[PDB]
Amino acid sequence: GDLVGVNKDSYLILETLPTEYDSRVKAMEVDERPTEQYSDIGGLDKQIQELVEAIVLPMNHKEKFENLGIQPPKGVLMYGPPGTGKTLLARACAAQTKATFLKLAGPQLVQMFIGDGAKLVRDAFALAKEKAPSIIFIDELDAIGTKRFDSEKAGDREVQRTMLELLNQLDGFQPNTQVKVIAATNRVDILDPALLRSGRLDRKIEFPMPNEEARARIM
Amino acid sequence: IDAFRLINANMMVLGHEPRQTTSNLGHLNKPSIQALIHGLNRHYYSITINYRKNELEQKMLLNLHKKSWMEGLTLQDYSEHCKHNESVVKEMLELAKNYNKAVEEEDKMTPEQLAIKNVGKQDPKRHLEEHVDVLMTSNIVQCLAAMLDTVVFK
Amino acid sequence: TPNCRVALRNDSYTLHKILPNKVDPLVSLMMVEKVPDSTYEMIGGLDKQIKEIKEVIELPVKHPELFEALGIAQPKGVLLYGPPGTGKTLLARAVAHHTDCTFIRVSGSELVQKFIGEGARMVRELFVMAREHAPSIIFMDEIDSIGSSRLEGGSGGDSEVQRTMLELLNQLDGFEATKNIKVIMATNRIDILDSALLRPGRIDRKIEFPPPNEEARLDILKIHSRKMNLTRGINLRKIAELMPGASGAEVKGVCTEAGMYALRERRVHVTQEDFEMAVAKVMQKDSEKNMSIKKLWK
Amino acid sequence: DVLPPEADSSIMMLTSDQKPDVMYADIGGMDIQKQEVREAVELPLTHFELYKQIGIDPPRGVLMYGPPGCGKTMLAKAVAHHTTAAFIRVVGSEFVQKYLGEGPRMVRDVFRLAKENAPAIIFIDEIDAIATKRFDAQT
Amino acid sequence: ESDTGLAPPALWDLAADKQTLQSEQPLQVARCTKIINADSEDPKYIINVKQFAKFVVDLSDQVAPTDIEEGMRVGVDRNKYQIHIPLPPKIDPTVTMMQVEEKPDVTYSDVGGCKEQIEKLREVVETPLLHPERFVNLGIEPPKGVLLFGPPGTGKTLCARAVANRTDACFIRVIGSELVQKYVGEGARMVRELFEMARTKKACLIFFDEIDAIGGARFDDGAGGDNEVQRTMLELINQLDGFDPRGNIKVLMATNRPDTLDPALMRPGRLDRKIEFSLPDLEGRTHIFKIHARSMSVERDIRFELLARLCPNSTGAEIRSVCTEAGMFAIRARRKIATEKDFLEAVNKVIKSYAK
Amino acid sequence: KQEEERSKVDDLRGTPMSVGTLEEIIDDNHAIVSTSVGSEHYVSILSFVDKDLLEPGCSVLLNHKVHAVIGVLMDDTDPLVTVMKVEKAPQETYADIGGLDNQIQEIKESVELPLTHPEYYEEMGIKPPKGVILYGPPGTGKTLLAKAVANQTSATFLRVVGSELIQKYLGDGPKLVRELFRVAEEHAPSIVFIDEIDAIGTKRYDSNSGGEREIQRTMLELLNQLDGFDSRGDVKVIMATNRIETLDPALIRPGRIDRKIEFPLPDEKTKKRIFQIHTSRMTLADDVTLDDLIMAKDDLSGADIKAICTEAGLMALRERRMKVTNEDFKKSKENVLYKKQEGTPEGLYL
Amino acid sequence: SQLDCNFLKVVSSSIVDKYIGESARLIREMFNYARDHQPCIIFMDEIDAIGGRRFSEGTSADREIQRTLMELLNQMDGFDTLHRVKMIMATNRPDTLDPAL
Ligand SMILES: Nc1ncnc2c1ncn2[C@@H]1O[C@H](COP(=O)(O)OP(=O)(O)OP(=O)(O)O)[C@@H](O)[C@H]1O
Ligand SMILES: Nc1ncnc2c1ncn2[C@@H]1O[C@H](COP(=O)(O)OP(=O)(O)OP(=O)(O)O)[C@@H](O)[C@H]1O
Numbered sequence A: 001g002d003l004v005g006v007n008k009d010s011y012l013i014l015e016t017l018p019t020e021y022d023s024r025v026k027a028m029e030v031d032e033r034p035t036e037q038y039s040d041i042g043g044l045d046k047q048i049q050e051l052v053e054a055i056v057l058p059m060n061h062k063e064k065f066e067n068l069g070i071q072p073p074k075g076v077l078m079y080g081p082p083g084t085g086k087t088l089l090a091r092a093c094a095a096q097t098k099a100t101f102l103k104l105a106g107p108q109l110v111q112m113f114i115g116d117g118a119k120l121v122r123d124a125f126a127l128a129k130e131k132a133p134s135i136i137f138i139d140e141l142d143a144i145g146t147k148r149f150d151s152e153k154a155g156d157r158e159v160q161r162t163m164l165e166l167l168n169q170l171d172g173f174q175p176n177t178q179v180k181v182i183a184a185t186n187r188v189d190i191l192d193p194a195l196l197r198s199g200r201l202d203r204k205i206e207f208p209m210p211n212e213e214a215r216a217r218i219m
Numbered sequence B: 001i002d003a004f005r006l007i008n009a010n011m012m013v014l015g016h017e018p019r020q021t022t023s024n025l026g027h028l029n030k031p032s033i034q035a036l037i038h039g040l041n042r043h044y045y046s047i048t049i050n051y052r053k054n055e056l057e058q059k060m061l062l063n064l065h066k067k068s069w070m071e072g073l074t075l076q077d078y079s080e081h082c083k084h085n086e087s088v089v090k091e092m093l094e095l096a097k098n099y100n101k102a103v104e105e106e107d108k109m110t111p112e113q114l115a116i117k118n119v120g121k122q123d124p125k126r127h128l129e130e131h132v133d134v135l136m137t138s139n140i141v142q143c144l145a146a147m148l149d150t151v152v153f154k
Numbered sequence C: 001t002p003n004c005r006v007a008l009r010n011d012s013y014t015l016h017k018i019l020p021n022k023v024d025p026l027v028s029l030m031m032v033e034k035v036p037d038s039t040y041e042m043i044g045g046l047d048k049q050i051k052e053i054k055e056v057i058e059l060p061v062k063h064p065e066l067f068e069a070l071g072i073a074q075p076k077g078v079l080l081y082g083p084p085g086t087g088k089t090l091l092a093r094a095v096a097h098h099t100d101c102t103f104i105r106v107s108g109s110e111l112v113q114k115f116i117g118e119g120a121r122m123v124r125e126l127f128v129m130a131r132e133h134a135p136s137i138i139f140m141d142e143i144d145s146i147g148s149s150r151l152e153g154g155s156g157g158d159s160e161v162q163r164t165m166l167e168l169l170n171q172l173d174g175f176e177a178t179k180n181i182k183v184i185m186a187t188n189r190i191d192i193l194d195s196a197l198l199r200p201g202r203i204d205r206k207i208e209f210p211p212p213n214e215e216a217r218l219d220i221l222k223i224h225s226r227k228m229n230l231t232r233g234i235n236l237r238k239i240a241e242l243m244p245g246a247s248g249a250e251v252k253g254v255c256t257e258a259g260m261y262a263l264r265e266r267r268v269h270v271t272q273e274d275f276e277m278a279v280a281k282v283m284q285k286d287s288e289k290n291m292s293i294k295k296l297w298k
Numbered sequence D: 001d002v003l004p005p006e007a008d009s010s011i012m013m014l015t016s017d018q019k020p021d022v023m024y025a026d027i028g029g030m031d032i033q034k035q036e037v038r039e040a041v042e043l044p045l046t047h048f049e050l051y052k053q054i055g056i057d058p059p060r061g062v063l064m065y066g067p068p069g070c071g072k073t074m075l076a077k078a079v080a081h082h083t084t085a086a087f088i089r090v091v092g093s094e095f096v097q098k099y100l101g102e103g104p105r106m107v108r109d110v111f112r113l114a115k116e117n118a119p120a121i122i123f124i125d126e127i128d129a130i131a132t133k134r135f136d137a138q139t
Numbered sequence E: 001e002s003d004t005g006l007a008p009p010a011l012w013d014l015a016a017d018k019q020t021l022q023s024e025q026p027l028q029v030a031r032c033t034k035i036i037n038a039d040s041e042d043p044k045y046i047i048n049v050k051q052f053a054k055f056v057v058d059l060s061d062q063v064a065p066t067d068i069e070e071g072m073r074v075g076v077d078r079n080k081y082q083i084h085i086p087l088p089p090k091i092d093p094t095v096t097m098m099q100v101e102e103k104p105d106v107t108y109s110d111v112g113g114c115k116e117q118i119e120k121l122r123e124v125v126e127t128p129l130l131h132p133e134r135f136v137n138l139g140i141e142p143p144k145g146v147l148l149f150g151p152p153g154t155g156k157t158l159c160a161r162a163v164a165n166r167t168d169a170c171f172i173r174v175i176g177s178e179l180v181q182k183y184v185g186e187g188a189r190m191v192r193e194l195f196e197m198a199r200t201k202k203a204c205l206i207f208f209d210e211i212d213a214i215g216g217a218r219f220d221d222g223a224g225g226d227n228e229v230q231r232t233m234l235e236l237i238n239q240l241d242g243f244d245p246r247g248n249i250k251v252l253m254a255t256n257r258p259d260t261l262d263p264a265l266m267r268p269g270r271l272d273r274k275i276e277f278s279l280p281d282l283e284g285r286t287h288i289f290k291i292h293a294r295s296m297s298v299e300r301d302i303r304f305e306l307l308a309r310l311c312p313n314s315t316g317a318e319i320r321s322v323c324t325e326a327g328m329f330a331i332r333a334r335r336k337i338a339t340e341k342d343f344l345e346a347v348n349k350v351i352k353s354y355a356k
Numbered sequence F: 001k002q003e004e005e006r007s008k009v010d011d012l013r014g015t016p017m018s019v020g021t022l023e024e025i026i027d028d029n030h031a032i033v034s035t036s037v038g039s040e041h042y043v044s045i046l047s048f049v050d051k052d053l054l055e056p057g058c059s060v061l062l063n064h065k066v067h068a069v070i071g072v073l074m075d076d077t078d079p080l081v082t083v084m085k086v087e088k089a090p091q092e093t094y095a096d097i098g099g100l101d102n103q104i105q106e107i108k109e110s111v112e113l114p115l116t117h118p119e120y121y122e123e124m125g126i127k128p129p130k131g132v133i134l135y136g137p138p139g140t141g142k143t144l145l146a147k148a149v150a151n152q153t154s155a156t157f158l159r160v161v162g163s164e165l166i167q168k169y170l171g172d173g174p175k176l177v178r179e180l181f182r183v184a185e186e187h188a189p190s191i192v193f194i195d196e197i198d199a200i201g202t203k204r205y206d207s208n209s210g211g212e213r214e215i216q217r218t219m220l221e222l223l224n225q226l227d228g229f230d231s232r233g234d235v236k237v238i239m240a241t242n243r244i245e246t247l248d249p250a251l252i253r254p255g256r257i258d259r260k261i262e263f264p265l266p267d268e269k270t271k272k273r274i275f276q277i278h279t280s281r282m283t284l285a286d287d288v289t290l291d292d293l294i295m296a297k298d299d300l301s302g303a304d305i306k307a308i309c310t311e312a313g314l315m316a317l318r319e320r321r322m323k324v325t326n327e328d329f330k331k332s333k334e335n336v337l338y339k340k341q342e343g344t345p346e347g348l349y350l
Numbered sequence G: 001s002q003l004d005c006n007f008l009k010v011v012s013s014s015i016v017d018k019y020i021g022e023s024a025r026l027i028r029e030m031f032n033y034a035r036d037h038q039p040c041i042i043f044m045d046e047i048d049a050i051g052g053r054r055f056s057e058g059t060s061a062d063r064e065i066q067r068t069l070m071e072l073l074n075q076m077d078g079f080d081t082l083h084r085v086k087m088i089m090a091t092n093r094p095d096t097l098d099p100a101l
């Protein structure tokens, strides 16, 4: 599967040619995350710490978690009412761990032909574990997270594979302790309990309604 | 193999290849369509090449390439030899039956035009005596080499 | 010269020689060359469909001065249709037999060719061969796939075989109204193919094929029982009376099953009862008899 | 040179590895259905004089059906064991390709193979992939 | 006979003796390709033919490795495939063809009734151009881009022209489909050319009309073999920020569909303010009737309130259509003026045929 | 013996001349061309090539050594702008059709009135309409009505079927639109009649493949040059399809087309003329009774009437006669008309 | 991990494509590697995606997956003899499949 440089006459392998791919995940690579100060967030400081306890200490103390006898998790879920910081939190924490943020929208996965999301998901998870200990964020997986065993038109065929090819990529067969997933929704019960259990996303981060004291802090 | 030689571009008013006292130039090659398209004759010209053959080279090349001493008196032992005299009889028989089929047929309405517009180049005497000649010469060479070694070896 | 192929030199690109005969690759499908396969009297019962076809094909050929004397033009377009396949090939092969005229059969599934353009170019290359022999008839077999409907292009209904249907409709009458060319199209399902070639500007004869009647079913039975071995004391009408809306081909199935029953007994004779169990084998339908499906609705 | 005719277009014969490897008497229980196919396929092949005498014209083909696991492929193997034809079998969903025209051309390649060759036997396993009733090709 | 490109000898007779021989053996033949990518400090350029293969070749010493970017038609050798002098697509004046800088024939009173958004367009356009004082003293950065959205023909083109004659300096209208080109990487060069040659002159206005075509539509979900709208869209969001350190020139977009919305555009620094247009209540309709009747021969004793009461939901293109249709009723007979009942039929003809 | 300099240049170029394709023209004695395999070359151009007719979209002559532009080539007999012009006259003027006089004043005021009497528009300053849509049930009166109005005109007329604009050379589509509208502009204010426009315009889908984009760009450039708004010179365009709901919406919206004429149903009034029109050019004997055929059958078009008269002519020639009797008409009425009679609620509604 | 020779892991969701016959080509390509190499295990996860029940007129996208499924039913157990090959299927919805599977 390698794109080696070949002589035009002898047909000799001499070059390596670093092997690019489709432009779509290239368009998904978002670098240069601006440093957002955590104090911009009001009233949600417990969830900030529980996130920093979840991800940053696995990034720093790589050998504290190995001699103790445990494994750091790799699945964190944010949920709550839409507009409470689902897109204000982890991209404020992606700004200090220098680990190459990589977004993933929900409805971009749904394409017109069949078997497009199964290519597009796997190649996105390919490129991250090709790289350094990167961070994959998925935004609105409520779109591709159906409530399965239901064969009803038209969302009965195109979603469940892309749902699965996600799921079999997360834990799957081989261990994927190279890249962390901080995927977030705004809805819980519409999900089917397939990836919804532990192993995958288990750190349930509820977002409460901002208080009077939280909103006055934010203003 | 061909060699060539460039003519100058100053002889544009005079015809190229200034031949004077020779008539061998019509020989040894004529300029083909794949040659006169690129540069002949307006850029370069062709030249004749002969082969410097002599003695002290030619007979010693033949006597070491196409020559065998021990091979000219072998016997090619008769497991496959008389076996080769059996696969050829059958196909010759079928050609003989096919030769039988045409000779008994004998179209005799406009024969000379029917014969010339309907040729096959395999029936009459093409496949009839070709293999027959080959089987005849082989056993003669084989038996004569068999008889000579019986005369020689005791 | 129109459609004149020439020999070109491959080095200087100069002319070499005017070439012989015109563009006709793959004429192995064309020019069937074998005249006897079947006679005329082995059809029976469908004589009206026979007389219409004979005097819509052989009459424009053998006496064109009659049609050139009234003032109207001669027909060239024939459509045959019958859903179970009754007289859809036999009537074709018979008229292909006693005509002394060139017969070209092309199934409507061959022109598809792998990449673009090639499947389109041989359309016109056929008709120029068809006009090359003016006494000729082209037969089309199962024009149902190529010729269905002009759908969208971005969604399904790929516009690749559509160009051939455009070419076929615009060749016979797009440029010049040709002559001595009769076409025959044979398929069922006359609700799913396209209707633009179904206007009376192109096809004049929509000859159908009804299921055979009891007199017709008797006549088909006498065809196939002619070569068998029959025992005396048998009625053939009552066999046809036990076929309520048969399909012509089912007469063969009854003849084979009655033959197969006499085979296992090692007997060259056949009874009336052999056919009675033969028809009852073939009459196996989902509209079961029950006496109550058809009597509650009287 | 001129190549011999039909040196191409598929290679789908069963001679000498691979074999079905089952005897005809292995299937216990089909006293009619084993007897029915054998009348239709093997019996025309040898005893052709019996059909011609009556004028039966032995049948061209045979549809088998029913629930799974009744003995369908197992019968076709023991047919293929005791036969002297070039047994040519094919998966149903095999000859459908990305490029148009490939499917129907492979249909022609199979039939010209078997017709030009010996009195062979063509076996298609499933056709419900490619043989339902037809409607308006919207796609 | 034929032509084969001939002429009478008076202009090419002196050309055809020795200049043809100097255009054969000295003058070479090059080809065009496309450039996929590049490398750093060393060329190692990857070039595709799209018909032959993808080649990894090097540039010649005739050009400098400065302007050779991804996606440029360059000259390719026949033997060594080396990169010769690249070729530009089109030259030169493609900016003046859309920048007429001409006084338009639009009265400021041609939009009446929805004056609230016109004052918003007064503040966003006119005040950072001529009153940049309160922006400095208080401490808010002035906005520099506003998207317009809503029902079609509501007055989008009308209000965008109302600011055009208001200052009369460098108005640039961009057709949304004009940037939809055929070549790979064609508009993104033009977007570079528009942005540089507009920043030379001050007090300039650029309008993007119908950004449903190129301004962030589906970003890349339907075009999976060409990728031109996206590359231009990625380029324009790239050249808008970064290459605008405290500019003066304003850029406005308008859309019909309120769906083609980039959150990266609503990042603060590109697009900040939401201004939509809505339907007239009563009087903004009647004003348009007063607009499209004064230019034609009508009766001076007819009213326009009653007509707008018959039209609950209507746009200015529809109101213009009624006047043309009621125009045609007066032409159907020999009437040289327009009577009220011809307007009444034209209401019933336009509305009660397909709308409701 | 006098012609020398032209003879040398007839001999200067290479002999196996190939045929090229103009793509872009740069005025520095070299440009970019295209071969037949889509391979493109940075070649040059000579001086004798008569640089006046070099248009991107024209054909040229190329070489094998350097492949430079040997000479410009003509259109090589491509009559795609001249054949569609109707030279002769169409069918009968207004007495051919019957019972469509509701729709006649619409097209007469839209076409004849802007040309013959352009004073009603100038009395009030009101512009004429540009486009007219003719839709309705298929084969109703649409082609017959367009020939009826085009017969009564005093300007040139165009007949476009719509399939003769679609080619695959990636430029030929929108070029012939510009080449026709240049012919219509330079010549008299012709009547553009592009029939079957639903094959080119519907629902505006954009795919990634290269089979559909050759339609959309030709459609888009058509709407561009229809509304070019530079100098059109009052060119009247008549567009017609059968259905209307699966069409392009921006061609429907005003500013483009403001005339959407429908062609409704029939009756037993308009039929009797078409029976008389189709039974005029034949040896109609004095023993035929068409009135019994008219009253009996109650749903048929003129294309049905034509199919009756032809089958009546065929039945008379099968029995080896010249004239036609009534019986040939009776059987033709009973034979041909039995192909579509299906679906009626009889005796339910008085 | 233990007693492994040749272990294939199929996700059974990525084996669909936009082209009509390509998924069946993948399956036979998977099984010929299984005959290339002796004893081998084919693990297909989640049969619920590509399995399911046959039914009537069914939105032509679904016709492909039934053809992909019919290819799988034939190749692993059909006319030929699958030898030294074992198959581990694993899912969560065994309720509605093909009963022929
Ligand atoms: N009148 C008849 N006499 C004898 N046999 C008949 C008759 N009608 C039908 N058959 C039998 O029916 C079978 C079908 O042939 P036919 O031409 O009628 O339809 P077909 O062409 O096979 O249908 P399709 O066009 O669907 O293939 C033939 O084997 C034929 O023997
Ligand atoms: N009568 C029988 N005698 C012996 N074995 C049988 C019998 N019937 C079924 N079997 C066993 O059951 C299996 C039946 O499967 P077979 O390969 O015949 O196709 P099927 O399962 O019947 O049809 P399909 O594969 O289409 O579902 C055989 O492998 C065979 O081992």
Ligand SMILES: Nc1ncnc2c1ncn2[C@@H]1O[C@H](COP(=O)(O)OP(=O)(O)O)[C@@H](O)[C@H]1O
Binding pocket: A040, A041, A042, A044, A081, A082, A083, A084, A085, A086, A087, A088, A186, A218
């Ligand atoms: N804790 C917070 N403090 C300040 N602003 C917040 C907070 N949570 C959300 N926001 C604001 O919400 C806006 C976007 O809401 P967001 O979380 O993106 O909604 P969603 O993620 O559901 O689309 C941001 O502009 C941000 O300023």
